Amino acid sequence: STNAYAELAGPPKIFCKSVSKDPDFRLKQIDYVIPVQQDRSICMNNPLLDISDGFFTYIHYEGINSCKKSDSFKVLLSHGEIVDRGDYRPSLYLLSSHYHPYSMQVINCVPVTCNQSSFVFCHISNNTKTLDNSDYSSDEYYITYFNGIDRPKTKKIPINNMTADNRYIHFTFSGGGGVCLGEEFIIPVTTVINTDVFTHDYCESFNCSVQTGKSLKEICSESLRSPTNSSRYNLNGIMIISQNNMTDFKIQLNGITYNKLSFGSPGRLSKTLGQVLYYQSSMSWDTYLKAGFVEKWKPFTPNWMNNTVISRPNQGNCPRYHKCPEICYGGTYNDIAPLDLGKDMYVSVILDSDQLAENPEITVFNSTTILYKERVSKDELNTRSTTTSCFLFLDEPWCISVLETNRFNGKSIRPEIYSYKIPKYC
Ligand SMILES: *[C@@H]1O[C@H](CO)[C@@H](O[C@@H]2O[C@H](CO)[C@@H](O)[C@H](O)[C@H]2NC(C)=O)[C@H](O)[C@H]1NC(C)=O
Ligand SMILES: *[C@@H]1O[C@H](CO)[C@@H](O[C@@H]2O[C@H](CO)[C@@H](O)[C@H](O)[C@H]2NC(C)=O)[C@H](O)[C@H]1NC(C)=O
Ligand SMILES: *[C@@H]1O[C@H](CO)[C@@H](O[C@@H]2O[C@H](CO)[C@@H](O)[C@H](O)[C@H]2NC(C)=O)[C@H](O)[C@H]1NC(C)=O
Ligand SMILES: *[C@@H]1O[C@H](CO)[C@@H](O[C@@H]2O[C@H](CO)[C@@H](O)[C@H](O)[C@H]2NC(C)=O)[C@H](O)[C@H]1NC(C)=O
Ligand SMILES: *[C@H]1O[C@H](CO)[C@@H](O[C@@H]2O[C@H](CO)[C@@H](O)[C@H](O)[C@H]2NC(C)=O)[C@H](O)[C@H]1NC(C)=O
Ligand SMILES: *[C@H]1O[C@H](CO)[C@@H](O)[C@H](O)[C@H]1NC(C)=O
Ligand SMILES: *[C@H]1O[C@H](CO)[C@@H](O)[C@H](O)[C@H]1NC(C)=O
Numbered sequence: 001s002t003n004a005y006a007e008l009a010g011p012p013k014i015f016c017k018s019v020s021k022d023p024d025f026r027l028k029q030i031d032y033v034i035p036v037q038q039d040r041s042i043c044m045n046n047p048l049l050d051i052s053d054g055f056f057t058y059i060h061y062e063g064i065n066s067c068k069k070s071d072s073f074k075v076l077l078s079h080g081e082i083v084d085r086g087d088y089r090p091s092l093y094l095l096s097s098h099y100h101p102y103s104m105q106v107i108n109c110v111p112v113t114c115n116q117s118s119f120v121f122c123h124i125s126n127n128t129k130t131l132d133n134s135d136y137s138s139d140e141y142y143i144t145y146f147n148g149i150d151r152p153k154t155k156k157i158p159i160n161n162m163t164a165d166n167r168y169i170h171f172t173f174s175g176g177g178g179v180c181l182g183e184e185f186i187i188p189v190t191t192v193i194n195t196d197v198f199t200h201d202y203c204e205s206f207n208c209s210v211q212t213g214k215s216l217k218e219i220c221s222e223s224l225r226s227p228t229n230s231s232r233y234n235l236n237g238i239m240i241i242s243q244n245n246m247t248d249f250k251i252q253l254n255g256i257t258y259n260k261l262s263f264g265s266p267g268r269l270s271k272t273l274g275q276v277l278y279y280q281s282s283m284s285w286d287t288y289l290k291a292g293f294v295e296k297w298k299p300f301t302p303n304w305m306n307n308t309v310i311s312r313p314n315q316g317n318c319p320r321y322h323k324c325p326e327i328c329y330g331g332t333y334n335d336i337a338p339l340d341l342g343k344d345m346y347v348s349v350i351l352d353s354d355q356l357a358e359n360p361e362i363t364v365f366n367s368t369t370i371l372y373k374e375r376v377s378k379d380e381l382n383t384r385s386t387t388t389s390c391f392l393f394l395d396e397p398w399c400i401s402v403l404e405t406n407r408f409n410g411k412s413i414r415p416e417i418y419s420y421k422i423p424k425y426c
């Protein structure tokens with residue numbers, strides 16, 4: 001929470017808002033934060049990073065000969081700060097680090113950094129298939145928090161007293177980060193319901209090649225079904241937790257607006273430019289960027305951006321750039337951060353590729369066109385998830401991104417942190 005760090009907010013600063021060719025991001029890797037493992041069987045996957053008010057929470061999953069979070073035998077929780085080391089750029093300083101008490105039984109986690117302390121919201125279960133075979137009464141939900149001087153403490157969330165805005169059999173914390181607004185945490189969630197209660201207008205308004213044997217209404221209704229258990233529907237939502245000195249809890253679970261639904265996936269809430277931005281990874285037929293600022297909390301309603309440029313790679317009938325309704329599952333999580341509201345521009349580390357997860361490119365865009373880009377590595381680089389957060393450092397916009405990278409295929413896999421500066425000139 002240094003004098004150098006300030007949330008990116010207030011009046012716009014001076015930097016490049018336009019097309020630019022070969023710009024200077026001042027791109028540098030950060031190597032001392034993420035732990036190192038000599039055992040090449042261990043796979044450090046699904047990095048998560050949330051940054052608020054000068055402090056960061058970092059989370060990553062470690063598992064043996066598997067890159068899946070439920071297979072992780074250790075899940076890592078780090079707390080740190082953003083500081084001026086005097087090299088004219090922001091540096092990450094790592095205060096404390098711990099392992100989740102329940103790591104072996106951890107299904108999924110989401111970080112949120114609040115009041116200069118780390119919070120980690122976890123869905124932990126003895127069933128790895130729990131979001132198919134089971135319900136949320138049989139699993140457990142925890143909050144692990146620490147500030148780096150302290151001892152980490154984890155408390156069970158009273159899910160039994162939760163209020164819901166619909167009848168859900170299951171839910172998981174899924175995404176790259178959450179926010180704290182006042183006394184309440186809000187976490188990206190995905191819900192499971194066994195009957196089809198959803199209305200797809202947006203999907204149904206699409207006139208294009210549609211396979212014979214099924215109606216638009218039909219494939220749209222069916223596109224929200226869990227590809228593992230077809231009798232279940234996965235719908236994104238938020239969980240709001242009121243908390244008093246971490247004692248009296250008020251939990252309520254609401255579903256996302258029905259306006260432009262997409263199959264339930266990981267996504268995130270973030271405070272930026274004095275607003276709250278929701279991102280949702282696009283795992284279904286609509287392959288373009290799905291995100292928006294939150295105009296209305298009940299029902300949870302982000303004003304969805306209409307974006308014709310930013311997309312993601314996937315194998316199957318929904319590769320990059322493909323917007324026609326279809327029943328398909330896949331794609332990668334690349335979340336975004338806003339720079340200027342008036343010029344409507346955002347930064348994201350996106351994969352430049354159609355079917356394959358690789359070639360991370362730092363991209364700066366408006367909703368219509370891509371203003372400018374730079375490949376992170378000059379050599380071909382294998383990469384899956386990317387998270388990005390931005391801020392003001394010495395009164396200039398700077399970003400920190402974590403890339404989920406597999407460098408030497410099947411060798412020791414660790415995510416890589418990078419930092420860069422938004423160009424002052426075009
Ligand atoms: C697919 O999802 C359905 C929906 O919950 C599961 O069906 C339930 O299974 C539990 C498990 O014992 C029963 O208690 C319920 O009575 C079932 N409900 C219905 C409506 O059938 C089913 O188990 C899932 N299948 C797989 C293979 O995961
Ligand atoms: C996951 O399964 C484990 C093992 O059965 C459960 O841990 C035990 O829970 C019982 C309560 O029924 C306690 O009496 C034992 O002391 C626990 N064992 C240990 C080693 O702590 C656990 O409750 C289950 N949790 C979830 C979320 O399913
Ligand atoms: C983070 O800090 C803010 C203020 O610094 C806390 O906000 C207050 O929380 C108490 C509960 O202990 C409420 O009674 C007040 O109404 C809140 N004030 C405002 C202005 O919202 C907030 O609870 C803190 N969050 C955490 C997780 O510690
Ligand atoms: C993306 O386009 C939609 C329309 O295709 C915009 O939706 C409108 O939003 C305004 C402000 O919320 C409403 O007054 C209109 O009624 C909406 N029209 C609809 C829903 O058909 C939407 O605002 C656009 N995205 C952004 C970020 O402005
Ligand atoms: C987003 O920013 C881009 C910046 O390139 C805008 O594209 C330009 O729009 C101006 C109009 O002010 C034209 O003179 C340029 O020729 C456009 N450039 C290109 C490469 O097409 C775009 O209009 C902006 N869109 C929104 C919604 O703000
Ligand atoms: C949940 O627990 C709290 C105390 O922690 C209690 O006051 C409340 O009544 C419980 N909810 C239900 C539905 O019993
Ligand atoms: C649907 O496609 C036709 C082209 O066959 C086009 O003329 C029409 O404007 C489109 N309508 C919508 C709502 O997309």
Ligand SMILES: *[C@H]1O[C@H](CO)[C@@H](O)[C@H](O)[C@H]1NC(C)=O
Binds near residue numbers: 245
């Ligand atoms: C909760 O906050 C109060 C101040 O409002 C403080 O006195 C108390 O020590 C805190 N709780 C614990 C368990 O320390």
